[PDB]
């Protein structure tokens, strides 16, 4: 059924699975109109489809043109996500198709399930975790390709850079969620922490800095402190 | 007016005839039910004093033959049986009447309840859902499962209902996924009413048949079927005005007749709050909504 801390390690076995997060699919800025009323303006968005075992991130970018003349966009967004994930799966060779798709939000289950009727053997599951994938647009190179897109466009990343050369998928997933959780709770500090020392660079083909094993421990610790801190500043403890 | 004689009543039993019922005592001298209105389908049903487990009964149409009941002490139940010797049947009946050992089907003349609960029930279709071709009447009980309960295990004793499934390729046209799941009019109007039922009167018939099996036998799978056939209309934006009106009448009498105490197991909160308040037809069931609000406001 659903996914939680008890069946946490299943993510890193050898059945192919993807997480889908639709948080950043429909994005708006809210502003006032000349008549003093409120209106929204949509900005480009994206579907966040991730293989937690490999790091492969299927970033499907959602251009604002997809909303033109549409009503009830928050509901459409969930169905648009489901269409794109289904289209993604269909485009994959059978041996690359996932055996499970875990949605980060329960509202996506019916839309995806209905779009996936042709794949009765692919399990669509929710999860009880509070995964921080919505902070993916706090990742500069992701935010950039999304905002610059002029048309629908799929872009492939490895969200773990070359980490799997030195660590396991389990540890790689733990680092990513720690980073993203930090970015979600205090973007400014989260980023100050990652980029203070201009002598650690981000290779052109990576998303994150090229930290050494020891430097990553220090990073990971400082991100923990930030999350606790922000939890105090927030809860006064 | 027809008669459904009983050979005897060896065990204490509650007997039901349509929406009536009366208690018969172990070896009380009972010989059947007289004055049954011809022209409708009927159900005669049983619940043994000893074992309130297993309500069971028989759908039958008097125009299709002469039927009687005889207790079988091997199988332990009141069985329906057909008499082909017509004279033997008129003769047996006449003797039991002259001695007045039959209760009278007790229809109040103002009362249209039975007609209103069975307007579209067809006996020959019933036979093609409770498959058993060697009898003109149809046995149902509490525990019989449906074809779709068996997709999720004895097929001869199943209720072959019209399978409805809202996440199924039948129900969802490719490329119309969002549209067909949020507005089921294509599944209702083309897939079911035009391709399977043939017409709405047939849609109402199975719907009525499901409810009664639910109400009279506590058959859970028939309850599911009744709510689904309702859900499919309530979730369709484009329904013929005349179907909506008849459905409002249909449900009104179903809700009127439901025991006030069985509401918690026989009514599905989700489906009703959709029909009445959330869905396309929220403004289209005035009679059904009034009676549900005044009789079962707790459910909503
Ligand atoms: C076999 O046809 C599948 C669709 N159903 C029908 O046509 C029915 C019509 C009236 C009914 N009355 C009682 S049961 C029933 C079924």
For residue A45, the enclosing domain spans: 9-163
CA distance linking residue A2 with residue A124, whole number of Å: 9
Domain closes at, from A163, A179, A197 = A163
CA distance linking residue B275 with residue B297, whole number of Å: 15
All residues at 6 or more sequence positions from A135 whose CB lies less than 8 Å from its CB, including other chains: A180, A181, A183, A184, A187
Domain closes at, from A143, A163, A183 = A163
Total Cβ atoms within 10 A of residue B225: 28
Q: Does A87 touch chain B (CB under 8 A)?
A: no
Q: Does B179 touch chain A (CB under 8 A)?
A: no
β-sheet bridge partners, residue B34 = B104
Q: For residues A181-201, b (16+ Cβ closer than 10 Å) or e, as one string?
A: bbbbbbeebbeebbeeeeeee
| Cα B183 from chain centroid (whole Å) | 28
Longest dimension (CA), chain B: 70
Residue B184 has φ and ψ, to the nearest 5°, of -80, 20
CB B203 within 8 A of CB B193: yes
Q: Are residues A20 and A105 in the same domain?
A: yes
Q: Are residues A63 and A168 in the same domain?
A: no
* Residue among A40, A75, A46 nearest A149 (CA): A46
CA distance linking residue A80 with residue A64, whole number of Å: 12
All residues at 6 or more sequence positions from B109 whose CB lies less than 8 Å from its CB, including other chains: none
Instruction: Indicate which CATH number applies to the domain containing A231.
Output: 1.20.80.40
* Residue among B80, B47, B46, B87 nearest B62 (CA): B80
* Structural domains counted in chain A: 2
Determine, yes or no, domain membership for A210.
yes
- Cα(A121) to ligand 1 centroid in Å equals 33
CA distance linking residue B276 with residue B292, whole number of Å: 9
Strand pairing report for A100-103 and A123-125: parallel
Q: Does A66 touch chain B (CB under 8 A)?
A: no
In angstroms, the Cα distances linking B212 to A12, A214, B216, B260, B288 are 52, 73, 6, 15, 17
Q: Are residues A93 and A191 in the same domain?
A: no
Find where tokens 């992701």 sit.
A142
CB A184 within 8 A of CB A138: yes
- Cα(B118) to ligand 1 centroid in Å equals 12
Determine, yes or no, domain membership for A159.
yes
CB B5 within 8 A of CB B95: no
Sheet of B2-5, strands arranged across: B2-5, B32-36, B103-104
Structure tokens at A84: 């794109």
CA distance linking residue B283 with residue B270, whole number of Å: 17
CA distance linking residue B43 with residue B60, whole number of Å: 6
Q: Are residues A192 and A143 in the same domain?
A: no
Sequence-distant contacts of B20-26: CB under 8 A, at least 24 apart: B20/B105, B20/B106, B21/B45, B22/B103, B23/B49
- Cα(B124) to ligand 1 centroid in Å equals 9
For B172, the closest of A76, A83, A117 (CB atoms) is A117
All residues at 6 or more sequence positions from B21 whose CB lies less than 8 Å from its CB, including other chains: B14, B15, B45
Q: CATH number of the domain at B116-299, out of 1.10.340.30, 1.25.10.10, 1.25.40.550, 1.20.210.10?
A: 1.25.40.550
* Residue among A146, A139, A176 nearest A45 (CA): A146
Q: Does B169 touch chain A (CB under 8 A)?
A: yes
Q: Are residues A157 and A233 in the same domain?
A: no
Tell me the three state secondary structure of residue B96: helix
Instruction: Indicate which CATH number applies to the domain containing A122.
Output: 3.30.420.230
Total Cβ atoms within 10 A of residue B77: 17
Determine, yes or no, domain membership for A234.
yes
Determine, yes or no, domain membership for A4.
no
Q: Are residues A13 and A82 in the same domain?
A: yes
Cα angle for residues A155, A159, A162 (degrees, 5° grid): 115
Q: Are residues A50 and A29 in the same domain?
A: yes
Resolution of the structure in the document, Å: 1.8
Structure tokens at A173: 């997933």
Q: Are residues A154 and A51 in the same domain?
A: yes
| A211-A215-A219-A225 Cα dihedral, nearest 10 degrees | 180
CA distance linking residue B67 with residue B58, whole number of Å: 10
Structure tokens at A234: 């927030």
Ligand 1, pocket residues at CB < 6 Å: B 120-122, 125-126, 128-129, 162, 196-197, 202, 205-206, 209
Determine, yes or no, domain membership for A222.
yes
| A109-A115-A119-A121 Cα dihedral, nearest 10 degrees | 10
Longest dimension (CA), chain A: 58
CA distance linking residue B229 with residue B242, whole number of Å: 16
Domain closes at, from A163, A186, A218 = A163
Q: Helix-strand-coil percent breakdown of chain B, rounded to 5?
A: 40, 20, 40
Q: Are residues A59 and A136 in the same domain?
A: yes
CB B15 within 8 A of CB B45: yes
CB B4 within 8 A of CB B37: no
In angstroms, the Cα distances linking A168 to A50, A52, A160, B25, B182 are 16, 11, 11, 76, 43
In angstroms, the Cα distances linking B42 to B36, B60, B174, B213 are 9, 5, 43, 12
CB A56 within 8 A of CB A42: no
* Residue among A116, A210, A20 nearest B169 (CA): A116
Q: Are residues A29 and A144 in the same domain?
A: yes
CB B52 within 8 A of CB B122: no
Q: What residue in B sits closest to A110 (Cα-Cα)? A: B167
Report CB contact under 8 Å: B178, A117. no
Q: Are residues A87 and A14 in the same domain?
A: yes
* Residue among B297, B164, B298 nearest B230 (CA): B164
| Mutation site, B152, B167, B171, B177, interface A, largest A CB count within 10 A | B177
3-state SS, one letter per residue, for chain A: CCECCCCHHHHHCCCCEEEEECCCCCEEEEEECCCCCEEEEEECEEEEEECCCCCEEEEEEECHHHHCCCCCHHHHHHHHHHHHHHHHHHHCCHHHCCCEEEECCHHHHHHHHHHCCCCCCCEEECECCCCCHHHHHHCHHHHHHHHHCCCCEEEEEECCCCHHHCCCHHHHHHHHHHHHHHHHHCHHHHHHHHHCCCCCCCCCCCCCCCCCHHHHHHHHHHHHHHHHHHHHHHHCC
In angstroms, the Cα distances linking B89 to B37, B60, B65, B85, B98 are 18, 17, 11, 6, 14
CA distance linking residue B176 with residue A83, whole number of Å: 11
| B17-B18-B23-B27 Cα dihedral, nearest 10 degrees | 20
CB B126 within 8 A of CB B155: no
CB A68 within 8 A of CB A49: no
Total Cβ atoms within 10 A of residue B276: 20
Structure tokens at B10: 């060896």
Cα angle for residues A35, A39, A43 (degrees, 5° grid): 140
CB B267 within 8 A of CB B275: no
Sign, CA torsion A104/A106/A111/A116: positive
Sign, CA torsion A155/A161/A167/A172: negative
CB B197 within 8 A of CB B206: yes
Q: Are residues A153 and A54 in the same domain?
A: yes
Tell me the three state secondary structure of residue B265: helix
CB B105 within 8 A of CB B34: yes
Determine, yes or no, domain membership for A194.
yes
């Amino acid at each position: 059924g659903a996914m939680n801390s008890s069946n946490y390690a299943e993510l890193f076995n050898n059945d192919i699975k993807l997480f889908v997060d639709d948080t950043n699919v429909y994005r708006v800025t809210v502003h006032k109109t000349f008549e003093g009323n409120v209106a929204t303006k949509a900005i480009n968005g994206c579907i966040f489809t991730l293989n937690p075992k490999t790091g492969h991130l299927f970033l499907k970018i959602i251009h604002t043109s997809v909303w033109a003349g549409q009503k009830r966009l928050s509901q459409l967004a969930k169905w648009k996500t489901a269409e794109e994930v289904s289209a993604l799966v269909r485009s994959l060779p059978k041996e690359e198709q996932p055996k499970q798709i875990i949605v980060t939000r329960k509202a996506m289950l019916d839309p995806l399930e209905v779009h996936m009727l042709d794949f009765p053997n692919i399990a669509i599951r929710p999860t009880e975790l509070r995964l921080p994938f919505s902070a993916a647009m706090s990742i500069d190179k992701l935010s950039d390709v999304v905002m610059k897109a002029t048309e629908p466009q799929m872009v492939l990343f490895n969200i773990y850079d070359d980490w799997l050369d030195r660590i396991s998928s389990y540890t790689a997933f733990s680092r990513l969620t720690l980073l993203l959780r930090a970015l979600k709770t205090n973007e400014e500090s989260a980023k100050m922490i990652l980029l203070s020392d201009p002598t650690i660079t981000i290779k052109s083909y990576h998303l994150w800095p090229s930290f050494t094993d020891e430097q990553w421990i220090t990073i990971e610790s400082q991100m923990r402190d930030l999350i606790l801190t922000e939890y105090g500043r927030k809860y006064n403890v | 007016m027809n008669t459904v004689p009983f050979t005897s009543a060896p065990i204490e039993v509650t007997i039901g005839i349509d929406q009536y019922s009366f208690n018969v005592k172990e070896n009380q001298p009972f010989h059947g039910i007289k004055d049954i209105p011809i022209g409708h389908v009927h159900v005669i049903h049983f619940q043994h004093a000893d074992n309130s487990s297993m309500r069971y009964g028989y759908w039958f149409d008097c125009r299709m033959g002469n039927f009687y009941i005889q207790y079988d002490p091997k199988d332990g139940l009141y069985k329906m049986m057909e008499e082909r010797d017509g004279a033997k049947f008129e003769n047996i009946v006449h003797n039991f009447k002259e001695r007045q050992m039959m209760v009278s089907y007790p229809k109040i003349d103002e009362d249209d309840t039975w007609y209103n609960l069975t307007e579209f029930v067809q006996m020959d279709k019933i036979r093609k859902i409770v498959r058993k071709d060697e009898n003109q009447f149809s046995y149902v009980d509490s525990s019989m499962t449906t074809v779709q309960e068996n997709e999720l295990s004895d097929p001869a004793h199943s209720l072959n209902y019209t399978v409805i499934n809202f996440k199924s390729r039948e129900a969802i046209r490719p490329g119309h996924e969002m549209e067909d799941f949020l507005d089921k009019s294509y599944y209702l109007n083309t897939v079911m009413l035009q391709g399977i039922f043939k017409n709405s009167s047939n849609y109402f018939g199975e719907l009525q048949f499901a409810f009664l099996n639910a109400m009279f036998f506590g058959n859970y799978g028939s309850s599911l079927q009744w709510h689904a056939m309702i859900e499919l209309i309530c979730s369709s934006a484009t329904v013929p005005k005349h179907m909506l009106d008849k459905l409002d009448e249909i449900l009104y009498y179903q809700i009127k007749t439901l025991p006030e105490q069985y509401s918690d197991i026989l009514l599905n909160e989700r489906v009703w709050n959709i029909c009445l308040y959330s869905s396309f037809q929220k403004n289209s069931l005035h009679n059904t909504e009034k009676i549900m609000e005044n009789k079962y406001p707790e459910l909503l």
